[PDB]
Design a protein around this ligand. Structure first.
Ligand SMILES: O=c1[nH]cnc2c1c(-c1ccc(Cl)cc1)cn2-c1ccccc1
Ligand SMILES: O=c1[nH]cnc2c1c(-c1ccc(Cl)cc1)cn2-c1ccccc1
Ligand SMILES: O=P(O)(O)OC[C@H]1O[C@](O)(CO)[C@@H](O)[C@@H]1O
Ligand SMILES: O=P(O)(O)OC[C@H]1O[C@](O)(CO)[C@@H](O)[C@@H]1O
Lengths: 442, 442
């Protein structure tokens, strides 16, 4: 009775599966359609992309279905705002067909591809369009959650057009002035039929969030579940204010020199040289304010000590726990635990060290770090190889499969600048020698 | 250069403090005054108490300053709603003095007692009163965050009067009908001067949350920092729907029999008997729906396996990590690590095991568990001794000092029923023998 076995890769206790002669599968909670609402240049695509990046990173399979991309596919080349005219009978039919084709792909993603969240990125400015999306959701047993972005500031609208609209494939043959002018006319095509969400009377029973004036204010109505609550929390923590995220590892430590994993060793002579080089680098950046974050492990704290700046220690930033393999070299791991060594090499993201962690566990631990990084402005995170790969995979939208192999060398600062729909990444090697701890897949 | 030392109790790396002949202290971010807003019987005290319980448990020193308690102290016995009349010149002076005395204690708590959050629990229904609180906050360099509870449902108002108002010390000599009638008249005294928060025009620059219709809808304006964002997230996850929380440990394991700590041992013969007894108990509770949560450790999973109910494994529910002391008996800990043994006995909450955890680390790990427990209805959590003490300290509002000593015996279900401003706790021993793992302070 109650016989369990521990799965070799993830180390999960499962009931001993003495399946009968005819083993049965029973494969595989309700998926969600996130409905973007609002006029063009309201940051709907920005919200869609960023939210999808966060949801995928935390392990919720998410995909964006942008109706404009279906339109660029159906219609050869973009001519002008005339395509978006309410009196353009033909283009209105094409645009409806594109929205229906995107919804068809939403159904296939959620019901047949193991997707959990589909972000329907369109204007969805009319009650008619939204009623149709609701009908589609109800008939397919999908939940519907509306995210409306409301902003009437012309400075914000002009900034969005300049930052990411003029550079759109639609405006390839256009100069900045013509593209901006055409886009303003394009916005005007949607203004007459636009019916904002009304949670007070009409949309009282809908699950929604109204993001007002670039996240200055929020109207939240009927949050049904865990995932909607998480989305709301995320939207309330992110901002579009300019800032820089600097990510680096502690300076080279004594375990690095011996080729040993984990432990709590101190900086080597080179590691101390990096720490001084980092102080000079930080000083040269001339940042008004800078928050410095470290792990609770000695090597990151010693590195921060060289900066002569206040810093905060996070236990969540501590290197991946290697369990029984802590303080061992990779050669000693292969010779003492050959089965464990091979299992990790085959499934590096999901592999859990015995009495230790996986990269998957790291993500769960680092979620509060990410949420706080979003809230903050200029931040320097002094951490460890596996922790750094996880954070970098979040900022650079890298998959779980690529994450354990991202290059994060010692004595090198990764300068992240948020621009358009992601991060510009600059690498700055601080000219101090160290050992190489990067190991490619085999 | 960069010399650090590890603190004996918490195991935190600190700069080697070679203080000069004259060591200097420099003792000790801006505190927050949470302003409750709304008519009586709107759950302001419920919000105040619950939020304070959560904030203290996560490690943010928080205290409630209820103006009504200052009034019960200044005015001998309560007579009737006549005391609350707007034309009652004398009582209006007394009530103002009570609010000012509470604010005086708010200043002393935040500026001189190391308090981080002061919850000002009063009606604060007029712009005049709120302007005065803002002036008080600005002059003392305190942040102000407003929490308004808006509800016009008479069923909700009557329920609040019946649940917690009629049982108030004010209505000691009154029967349920007279107390209810007096309280309705008391509410009416505040209705004429009530000016709700207006984030649209008047209160546009104030940091606030409007909780509408018992958390059905929210208006969030200008969330300035981390703590306000956390409060908003918490308020959006809690509910007042009836439910039961059952908490228990895994059935007795092999390590329990050997007096060994940590590890991942399986159920003993008695532990398996408890698991069967738990299934019978669960069945007898006749719960429409029940969510079952376990840790990722074998003993809790084997216990859940006996229920024949779907369950979810949480790594956050895994027992406290004893680091180097894992799988050792307490006798072996005292003999191999006597310094460590004595340090723990002296400071059980903050003590961190070498390469392991503290009860303080457990709280940080269990925060997502608590947030999900709040969202849910009927939940059974099968966990471990230290994890259980932490969760119980949250529900029962126990301090960090009492937390490591809470009695959580094996083969015993703790049935938690939310009622009034906290939890009713029922203990159910499932009549299966086990060893005793409880150790009192020495
Ligand atoms: O509300 C907007 N209106 C116009 N533009 C916008 C936004 C937001 C935004 C919306 C909601 C939230 Cl919680 C945060 C940011 C981002 N952006 C944006 C700006 C420049 C480039 C790309 C996107
Ligand atoms: O909004 C209310 N109006 C009247 N009463 C109320 C509430 C809330 C409440 C308010 C906000 C939130 Cl996020 C959750 C619950 C709780 N209570 C309550 C009910 C019975 C006894 C004690 C308290
Ligand atoms: O996932 P990988 O490639 O083993 O890298 C993580 C390892 O790297 C180290 O930071 C040492 O370089 C160890 O602490 C950790 O076990
Ligand atoms: O804090 P205390 O009293 O040592 O209790 C926690 C210990 O109890 C155990 O659950 C064993 O009873 C251990 O796993 C853990 O180390």
């Amino acid at each position: 009775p109650l016989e369990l076995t521990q799965s070799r890769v993830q180390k999960i206790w499962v009931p001993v599966d003495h399946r009968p002669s005819l083993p049965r599968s029973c494969g595989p909670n309700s998926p969600t359609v996130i409905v973007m609402v609002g006029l063009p240049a309201r940051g709907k695509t920005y919200i869609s992309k960023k939210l999808t990046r966060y949801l995928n990173w935390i392990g919720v399979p998410t995909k964006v279905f942008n109706v404009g991309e279906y339109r660029r596919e159906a219609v050869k080349q973009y001519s002008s705002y005339n395509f978006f005219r309410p009196d353009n009978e033909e283009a209105m039919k094409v645009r409806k067909q594109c929205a229906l084709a995107a919804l068809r792909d939403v159904k296939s993603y959620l019901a047949k591809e193991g997707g959990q969240i589909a972000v329907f990125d369109a204007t969805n400015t009319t009650r008619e369009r939204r009623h149709m999306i609701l009908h589609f959701a109800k008939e397919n047993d999908f939940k519907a959650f509306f995210i409306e972005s409301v902003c009437d500031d012309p400075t914000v609208v002009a900034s969005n057009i300049m930052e990411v609209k003029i550079s759109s494939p639609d405006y390839k043959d256009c100069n900045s002035a013509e593209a901006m002018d055409d886009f303003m006319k394009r916005i005007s095509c949607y203004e007459a039929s636009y019916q904002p969400l009304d949670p007070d009377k009409c949309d009282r029973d809908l699950s929604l969030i109204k993001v007002i004036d670039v996240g200055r204010r929020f109207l939240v109505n009927r949050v049904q579940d865990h995932i909607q609550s998480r989305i709301v929390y995320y939207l309330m923590n992110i901002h579009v204010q300019p800032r820089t995220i600097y990510l680096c590892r502690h300076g080279e430590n004594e375990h690095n020199l011996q080729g040993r994993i984990g432990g709590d060793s101190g900086l080597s002579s080179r590691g101390k040289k990096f720490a001084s080089a980092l102080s000079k680098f930080v000083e040269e950046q001339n940042l008004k304010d800078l928050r410095v974050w470290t792990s609770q492990l000695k090597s990151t704290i010693q590195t921060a000590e060289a900066l002569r700046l206040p810093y905060e220690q996070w236990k969540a930033l501590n290197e991946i726990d290697a369990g029984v393999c802590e303080e061992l070299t990779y050669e000693e791991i292969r010779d003492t635990y050959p089965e464990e060594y091979a299992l990790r090499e085959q499934d590096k993201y999901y592999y859990r060290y015995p009495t230790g962690e996986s990269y998957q566990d790291l993500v769960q631990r680092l979620e509060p770090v990410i949420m706080e990084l979003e809230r903050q402005e200029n931040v320097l995170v002094i951490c460890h190889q596996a922790v750094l790969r996880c954070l970098l995979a979040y900022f650079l939208d890298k998959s779980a499969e690529e994450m354990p192999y991202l290059k994060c060398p010692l004595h090198t600062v990764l300068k992240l600048t948020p621009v358009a729909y992601g991060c510009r990444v600059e690498s700055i090697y601080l000219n101090v020698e160290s050992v190489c701890t990067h190991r490619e897949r085999s």
